[PDB]
């Protein structure tokens, strides 16, 4: 037996939820192959510490 909340959500919010999920998937697929999309932690790891930077400068 279907619960009341399930009926309400499927009658009200299912369509836009599915559309937004599709749009998010499309955007992720589009930007998967692009170059220049990195997380802050990854950017910090690539940048290195200060001492690593004086090592690189030398």
């Amino acid at each position: 037996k279907v619960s009341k909340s399930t009926k309400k959500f499927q009658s009200k919010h299912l369509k836009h939820t599915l559309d937004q999920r599709r749009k998010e998937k499309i955007q992720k697929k589009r930007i998967q192959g692009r170059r220049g999309n990195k997380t802050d932690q990854e950017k910090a790891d690539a940048a290195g510490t200060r001492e690593q930077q004086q090592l690189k400068k030398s």
């Binding site: 802050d40 910090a44 940048a47 290195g48 510490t49 200060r50 690593q52 930077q53």
Partner: protein, 334 residues
Amino acid sequence: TEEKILQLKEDIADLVTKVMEEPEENTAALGRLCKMVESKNPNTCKFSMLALVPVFKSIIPGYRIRPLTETEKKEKVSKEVSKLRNFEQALVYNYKNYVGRLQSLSKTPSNAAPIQVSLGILATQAAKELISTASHFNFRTDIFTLLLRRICKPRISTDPTSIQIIQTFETLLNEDEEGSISFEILRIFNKILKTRNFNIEESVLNMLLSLDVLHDYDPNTKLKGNVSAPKLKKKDRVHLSKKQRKARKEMQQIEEEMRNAEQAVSAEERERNQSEILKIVFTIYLNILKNNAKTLIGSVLEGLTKFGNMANYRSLRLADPLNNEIIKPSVNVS
């Protein structure tokens, strides 16, 4: 006199223990201990002056003590605050006297008896050790002046403390980002150099190479891995009354705007300090070049190469530059 030395050490230790654990109402102990430094007996002066360094390094607060005078207050309403104010004023007075004595003892023309030279060396070591943490305190200018006068001597190789003082100054300039302490040191350094017609050792001039205020790094540099609990867990909280929680919210909302304003002020002051320090450093370098000192050219050119873009013979020197293991000299090679 050896038993007298033991009795003096016992008295100093007793005073240090008396003032160490709870210094607010043991003020007279600290006052007498500081008075012992001015004693004409070399033994008392040495032992008290060397023992007072940990005392100050522990009892100096985390800020600068303002000259809070009663004229604007007219309060007379304090029970545990009045004693704190008295302790702060007495600490300022005693620290002032101690720093003055250190400065007076540092000045030794190297012609008196060796006891006075030893006194000056010990005073210089005490001042060097004190400035590592008392830089954010009153009368730092006197310590900076005496240390730089010791460093800016024409001959410093015979001094057994020049290495340590240069290392401390380099560390201070390296770890200072805002540029306040760096500018404060550079003003005195320029003032001393102008008196000596810009005549120092390449090694001395090498301290300006460590100025952090004249350095730029990656906007997203990786700091050290620092891990801490983000928030206290909800089920492990301490009970707070409604008034306590409201006061907590109010103080948090005040602290957030105070932090924002502090960041803005630091950002706007770093640029001005950087400009002033660039002016001073370039003036010093150009005056050295015009004087044409054969033993200072390489360091000057290295400084210009390092700090040029921020603007609008190793056996002939001691005290290799700070972080020399990674700072490969661009122009001042061997």
